[PDB]
Design a protein around this nucleic acid. Structure first.
Ligand SMILES: [Mg+2]
Lengths: 82, 95, 252, 51, 55, 446, 492
DNA sequence: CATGGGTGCGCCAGACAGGG
DNA sequence: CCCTGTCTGGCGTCCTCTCACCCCATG
């Protein structure tokens, strides 16, 4: 990793890049989620920006996945209750 | 590498000699050495043949001096009560 | 105790973790820049030379402070806002701040120049690769005018690089420096003598055409080839170099 | 006293075609330059061929 | 380990100044041959043919 | 614990709850303890090592004053022998009797018996003076010393570090050419010349036309001239040559100039001083150059012509790495360079987590106090100037001031969770207490 | 100071129910170890604490030995007796040594050794007093959950472990949860968890029934067997000697309340309770519940039982993934083959036909006479060869001469079959004849016999070329074996 | 013992007199 | 009151590294 130019080419604000990559790295580090790109024993920050460069993560997809994996948890709870 | 290597091929049974030593070479305390000399023990090969029970009968030899002798013999790989066949060799019988 | 196993642990945590280097009189924002550490046997911070022109840092006894971004948002701010590759233009204007300062412009000015006779005057060369091969083997000189065949890529279409190859009447050193120029720049950026204003507008035209990543890697290749041929130049200073005018005493 | 760090080609990253990049480690604090210079000067001229 | 030892630095190096001077060769009728003449500078602890053989 | 209060059972004293702990010292420096002083406030029991130092200094001062008496008595007896060469000399009878009676020998009332009486006055003065001074010196060693209010004894220990050189020290010549030494190369990589000798230091030429100190290049050329004369003396002396050729060459190297002040001649040195003068000149010949009346260019050229060096001062130099010649021959010579005491293992410092100040809960300042570097005001402006917001928040809340924030941070770092719980700076609460301690009512709304 | 030692010994003796002597011996060992650590040299040290004052003397102990290996800690018997004639091998010689000051370091060492002595005394006696708990259902609090085990706190510094195999497949415990389980093993891991607790093994089921069914705790009802598929289904077999008590009804309880309490503790495991019978066939019928058994055929020699069921009950008799038959087989100890009535008849017809074919082939009898032997219950040549002559003479139409001839034919058929197999491979005939040549292992003898080289004569007739394809036989080794065989056959 | 008793800076700027 | 002179206040670069020394005095 040297430059983050295409990670700004795909998220034009350059400040939303930091929020999206921080949210992604916090999901990968403590929450225990797998990286969507195969790593090379990089740290979670570079893996976050490496997922940004592929395009498969931004704030839209992160909100989609948090709503679907919150509805999945509450659906599992409701089907366990009733 | 083959060229550079071809351009350089014109360039490229009484124990052993320790038994024959005097008891003074064992670095024993002045007390232990003088107690052994009083019993006519001159060589390490003479000392190694004596049993612990025989050394305790020697006048003025204490339990402390016996432990010193064992620790020093053990540091050289020797133990009290080894039987040497043909000791002393005829090379020592004339002093 | 510093046992034998904590240095592998240390090369694990240093990796991909930027640090904030800071010169003590910080006047503008280019005086705090974030780097990645490379571990040093020693007790002195090794600081990349081009970056010195941003810090106003010479090496006459200067000191710098290192700060560690602890949290994760701060590591990302050091990599995405404050990294030294991201600060290549001064915020006061449009001028590049990673301009090559002093040794490297002497190495370039001695490299891309010419003299009216040298070894290999007016011979013809089938590419820049054998220009460097003729300089290294000892058959030509670094400044000896020569027709070469260079292939400059002009990007005249909409994002498509079109190759045009031709014979430029140039020198040996200009072809050797053409081996380092990225694809899109024309050959006439190296065809001149390359002082300091010319190398600054070379990096500026590279940034305006080819963007950021070729300009970072080309700034490094400029610095490496400037240091190497300034070492090969042997450009001393003597007492005879300061030529007194013969007309000076009659003027006085 | 005649025991040095005997090196080896850890990888041959041959980039594309008619082009390789051969890295050799580890050498002494000074033998990288003497083997690079020896192999560089011999390959340049000594190496024979036809043209 | 005791307080009575004194450690000096150790410059285990016998040679001082090695200068080679290449020059033209005429012993062999064939020309374009060279002679390599190496003037070393030992401090007496190393034989010169042994030095060139170990090198 | 029952076992802690059972100190009284096996031994006595009292309880063991008291923290047993021996004042151990910190790190950063090696050394060799060369000298230990122990001072004792009077009344306190001297321990065994303070009595060892007292016996040691008693023994040293005893030996020193006794050697004062012996050496001055030896000079006095040599004076008596020098006086009794004439006027009633005894060539054999002088050393038959003990030496303290060299006065009652056969000699009339002259200046010599007067001088022996004056030397007897001096000798008895030395005897009684030695008595009273040894008593006073035993008093000075044996007595205590007035000290601080409430201190028993002061122990001073002198460590003696030997600091060599490393990348990061500061060296400089005598003209303003500073510099941090940047790489300590091997011997082989150095540019050598067509004799074989490697150069020791490679400076940078580009500091000369801007920083206009052109005197260092004349100093370099004249130093090379001096070493050329020294090498020719070393060549004429290593071949075991007689003193005539050394006299010839040293005389030619000492004349060499215009109307000058020196004008020495070696014809009054007598064949033994010339060998010792050449023993002192073989590592180079020292040259004086006064300030504004110095050695001009033509004199440096004529002295570089006396040695067999090139006239322009520039030798062609080969390379160490490639082994092939540098084009356009370069300037070598000798420059007299100074090491300055701005070393690098006195400035280098690092801190993860150390002590914290008392009134404002921020880290301490300095190096001796294990402290952290001041993230000053202009650096805060330079991080406002980017968009770095979390870096500044942890740079002035978590890493610096907030105590619960930094203990949460330390637990979170050693557990792998990079996350900060922000809180408030405690020094802002100090600002609230200082403004609130006036008649002013500052608060925090909502 | 003095009286404080007595007060500490009395407090610890009363609180931990421990012999004062054992606490002092341990404090002496603790102080000796603390003393040894203050010397740069490895010394031997004895400490003696006075039991009235609490004062203590420290020695340089010298273990009286016959042969001294460690001169710093050992003394010869001859040297020890020079100081005190009363000393024997294994005694200690002392040396006036300064007793270590009782700082908080020795204090901490003494505390640790006391705690360790209490683990080997107070806690050991508590485990001995809880002999029932060591075997019954202990209750613990979950202290830690790992991937491979759960650590339980039992109180009093006792830790137990449930291994992953010892858990039910659907159980999820959290730190602070209360868990019951059977203490099935006590090992010697005092530091850590010496206690092993199970919830999956059959003992958990037995002990839950002992607690929930008073009639089992009073020994009025006995559990004879238990088979279990943990967290899915179990079977228990119950017996009573009191004809007034229904053992199944007692274990079920009013409306199943007792069996449902046990099932609920086991995460909803289904429990079948069956009556133990002393007749194996009747016990297997009971074990197969809830499937109705139509007939059972018992093979005592194979320890197997063929169970015929109606075609509608086959799926119930086998159960989901064979769970019902497997639990019945584990409960009975018999191998249980579940088939339809039609399949059992087809199996018996195929076995009868195979027995008739075997008898016709080997006994040189007609099919009619072979059928009579199978109808009288003879299925093997071994039965006909070895059965008492009286049972064969009870068959209608057999006389003493015909029975003798039939037995002689059966014995001759068995001999021929055995010899044939032993010659085909390397069991006995080629393992002696072909293996006579020195060097022949049993594997090589069977490889030779697979080529038709069955005897030492057959091997003597071979060439090296005839044996060259035998894996592990080199031409040299083949030549040596053929020559060894020839030396015995032709020159012996 | 315990408390308490110099005279080398220069500009800006607004508030306070001071005439005007 | 409308301009003029005076009088006091408020302020003047950032990081570091040593050192030396912190209230008498006394009835
Ligand atoms: Mg500077």
């Amino acid at each position: 990793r040297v430059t983050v130019q295409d990670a700004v080419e795909k998220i034009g604000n350059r400040f939303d890049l930091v929020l999206v990559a921080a949210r992604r790295a916090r999901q990968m580090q403590v929450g225990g989620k797998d990286p969507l790109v195969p790593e090379e024993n990089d740290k979670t920050t570079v893996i976050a920006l490496r997922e940004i460069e592929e395009g498969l993560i931004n704030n839209q997809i992160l909100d989609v996945r948090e709503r679907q994996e919150q509805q999945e948890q509450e659906a599992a709870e409701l089907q366990a209750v009733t | 590498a083959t060229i550079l290597a071809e351009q350089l091929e014109a360039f490229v049974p009484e124990f052993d000699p320790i038994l024959l030593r005097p008891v003074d070479d064992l670095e024993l305390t002045v007390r232990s050495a003088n107690c052994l000399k009083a019993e006519a023990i001159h060589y390490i090969g003479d000392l190694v043949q004596r049993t612990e029970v025989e050394l305790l009968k020697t006048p003025n030899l204490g339990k402390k001096s016996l432990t010193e002798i064992k620790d020093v013999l053990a540091s050289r790989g020797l133990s009290l009560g080894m039987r040497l066949e043909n000791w002393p060799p005829a090379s020592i019988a004339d002093e | 105790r510093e046992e034998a196993v904590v240095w592998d642990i240390l090369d694990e945590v240093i990796r991909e973790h930027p640090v904030l280097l800071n010169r003590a009189p910080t006047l503008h924002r280019l005086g705090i820049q974030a780097f990645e550490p490379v571990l040093i046997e020693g007790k002195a911070i090794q600081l990349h030379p081009l970056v010195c022109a941003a810090y106003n840092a010479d090496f006459d006894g200067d000191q710098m402070a290192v700060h560690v971004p602890l949290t994760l948002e701060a590591q990302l701010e050091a990599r995405a806002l404050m990294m030294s590759t991201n600060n290549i233009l001064s915020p006061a204007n449009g001028e590049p701040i990673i301009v090559p300062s002093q040794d490297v412009v002497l190495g370039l000015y001695y490299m891309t120049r010419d003299c009216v006779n040298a070894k290999g005057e007016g011979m013809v060369l089938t590419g820049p690769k054998e220009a460097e091969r003729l300089y290294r083997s000892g058959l030509a000189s670094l400044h000896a005018r020569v027709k070469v065949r260079i292939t400059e890529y002009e990007k005249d279409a909409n994002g498509e690089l079109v190759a045009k190859t031709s014979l430029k009447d140039t020198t040996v050193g200009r072809a050797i420096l053409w081996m380092i120029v990225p694809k899109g720049l024309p050959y006439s950026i190296v065809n001149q003598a390359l002082g300091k204003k010319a190398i600054s507008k070379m990096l500026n035209t590279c940034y305006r055409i080819l963007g950021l990543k070729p300009t970072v890697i080309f700034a490094d290749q400029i610095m490496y080839t400037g240091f190497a041929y300034a070492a090969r130049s042997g450009a001393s200073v003597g007492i005879d170099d300061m030529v007194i005018p013969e007309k000076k005493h009659e003027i006085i | 006293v005649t025991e040095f760090l005997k090196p080896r080609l850890v990888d041959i990253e041959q980039v594309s075609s008619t082009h390789a990049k051969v890295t050799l480690e580890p050498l002494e604090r000074g033998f990288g330059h003497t083997l690079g210079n020896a192999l560089r000067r011999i390959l340049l001229s000594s190496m024979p061929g036809c043209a | 380990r005791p307080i009575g030892r004194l450690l000096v630095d150790a410059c285990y190096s016998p040679v001082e100044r090695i200068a080679y001077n290449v020059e033209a060769a005429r012993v062999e009728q064939r020309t374009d041959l060279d002679k390599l003449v190496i003037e070393m500078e030992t401090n007496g602890t190393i034989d010169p043919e042994e030095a060139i053989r170990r090198a | 614990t029952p076992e802690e209060k059972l100190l009284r059972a096996i031994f006595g004293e009292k309880a063991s709850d008291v923290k047993d702990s021996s004042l151990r010292v910190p790190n950063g420096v090696s050394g060799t303890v060369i000298d230990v002083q122990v001072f004792t406030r009077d009344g306190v029991e001297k321990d065994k090592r303070a009595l060892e130092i007292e016996e040691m200094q008693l023994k040293q001062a005893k030996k020193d004053l006794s050697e004062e008496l012996q050496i001055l008595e030896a000079g006095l007896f040599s004076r008596i022998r020098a006086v009794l060469v004439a006027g009633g000399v005894e060539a054999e009878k002088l050393d038959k009797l003990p030496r303290d009676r060299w006065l009652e020998l056969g000699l009339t009332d002259e200046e010599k018996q007067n001088q022996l009486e004056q030397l007897a006055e001096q000798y008895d003065e030395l005897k009684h003076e030695f008595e009273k001074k040894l008593e006073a010196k035993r008093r000075k060693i044996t007595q205590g010393d007035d000290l601080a209010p409430g201190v028993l004894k002061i122990v001073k220990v002198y460590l003696a570090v030997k600091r060599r050189i490393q990348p990061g020290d500061k060296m400089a010549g005598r003209h303003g050419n500073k510099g941090v030494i940047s790489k300590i190369n091997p011997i082989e990589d150095m540019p050598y010349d067509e004799n074989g000798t490697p150069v020791d230091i490679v400076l940078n030429p580009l500091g000369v036309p801007s920083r206009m100190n052109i005197g260092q290049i004349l100093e370099t050329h004249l130093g090379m001239a001096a070493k050329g004369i020294g090498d020719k003396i070393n060549a004429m002396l290593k071949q075991q040559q007689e003193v005539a050729k050394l006299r010839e060459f040293i005389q030619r190297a000492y004349d060499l100039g215009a109307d000058v002040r020196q004008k020495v001649d070696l014809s009054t040195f007598s064949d033994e001083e010339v060998m010792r003068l050449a023993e002192n000149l073989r590592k180079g010949m020292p040259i004086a150059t006064p300030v504004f009346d110095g050695a001009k260019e033509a004199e440096i050229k004529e002295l570089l012509k006396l040695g067999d060096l090139p006239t322009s001062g520039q030798i062609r130099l080969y390379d160490g790495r490639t082994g092939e010649q540098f084009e356009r021959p370069v300037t070598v010579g000798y420059m007299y360079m100074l090491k300055l005491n701005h070393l690098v293992d006195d400035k280098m410092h690092a801190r993860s987590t150390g002590s914290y100040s008392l009134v404002t809960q921020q880290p301490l300042g300095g190096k001796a106090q294990f402290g952290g570097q001041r993230f000053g005001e202009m650096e805060v402006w330079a991080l406002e100037a980017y968009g770095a917001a979390y870096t500044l928040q942890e740079m002035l809340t978590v890493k610096s001031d907030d105590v619960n924030g930094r203990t949460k941070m330390y637990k979170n770092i050693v557990d792998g969770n990079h996350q900060m719980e922000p809180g408030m700076p405690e020094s802002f609460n100090v600002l609230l207490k200082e403004i609130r301690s006036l008649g002013i009512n500052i608060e925090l709304e909502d | 100071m003095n009286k404080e030692i007595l007060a500490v010994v009395e407090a610890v003796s009363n609180e931990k129910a421990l012999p004062r002597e054992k606490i002092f011996e341990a404090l002496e060992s603790a102080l000796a170890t603390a003393t040894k650590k203050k010397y740069e040299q490895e010394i031997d040290v004895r400490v003696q604490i006075d039991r009235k004052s609490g004062d203590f003397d420290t020695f340089r102990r010298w273990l009286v030995v016959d042969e001294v290996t460690q001169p710093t800690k050992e003394i010869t018997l001859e040297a020890a007796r020079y100081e005190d004639e009363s000393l024997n091998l294994g005694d200690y010689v002392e040396d006036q040594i300064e007793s270590v000051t009782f700082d908080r370091i020795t204090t901490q060492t003494a505390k640790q050794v006391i705690v360790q002595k209490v683990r080997e005394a107070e806690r050991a006696m508590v485990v001995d007093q809880f002999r029932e708990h060591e075997g019954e259902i202990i209750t613990g609090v979950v202290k830690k959950v790992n991937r491979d085990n759960i650590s339980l706190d039992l109180g009093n510094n006792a830790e137990a472990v449930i291994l992953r195999e010892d858990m039910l497949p659907r159980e999820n415990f959290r730190p602070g949860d209360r868990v019951r389980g059977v203490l099935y093993s006590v090992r010697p891991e005092a530091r850590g968890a010496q206690l092993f607790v199970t919830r999956s093994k059959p003992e958990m089921l037995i002990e839950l029934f002992r607690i929930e069914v008073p009639e089992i705790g009073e020994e009025v009802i006995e559990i004879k067997a238990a088979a279990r598929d943990p967290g899915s289904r179990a079977k228990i077999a119950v017996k009573t000697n009191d004809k007034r008590i229904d053992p199944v009804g007692a274990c079920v309880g009013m409306r199943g309340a007792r069996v449902q309490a046990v099932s609920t503790e086991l995460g909803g495991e289904r429990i079948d309770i069956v009556l133990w019978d002393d007749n194996p066939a009747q016990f297997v019928i009971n074990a197969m519940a809830p499937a109705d058994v139509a007939s059972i055929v018992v093979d005592e020699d194979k320890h197997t039982m063929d169970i015929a069921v109606e075609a509608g009950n086959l799926a119930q008799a086998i159960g989901r993934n064979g769970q019902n038959v497997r639990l019945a087989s584990q409960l009975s100890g018999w191998e249980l083959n579940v088939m339809t009535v039609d399949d059992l008849q087809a199996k018996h017809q195929a076995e009868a036909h195979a027995a008739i074919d075997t008898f016709t082939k080997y006994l040189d009898i007609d099919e009619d006479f072979a059928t009579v032997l199978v109808e009288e219950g003879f299925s093997t040549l071994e039965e006909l060869a070895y059965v008492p002559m009286k049972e064969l003479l009870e068959i209608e139409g057999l006389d003493e001469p015909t029975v003798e001839a039939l037995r002689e034919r059966a014995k001759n058929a068995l001999a021929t079959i055995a010899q044939a197999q032993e010659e085909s491979l390397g069991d006995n005939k080629p393992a002696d004849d072909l293996l006579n040549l020195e060097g022949v292992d049993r594997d090589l003898a069977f490889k030779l016999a697979a080529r038709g080289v069955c005897t030492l004569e057959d091997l003597a007739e071979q060439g090296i070329d005839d044996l060259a394809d035998i894996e592990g036989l080199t031409d040299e080794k083949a030549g040596a074996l053929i020559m060894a065989a020839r030396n015995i056959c032709w020159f012996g």
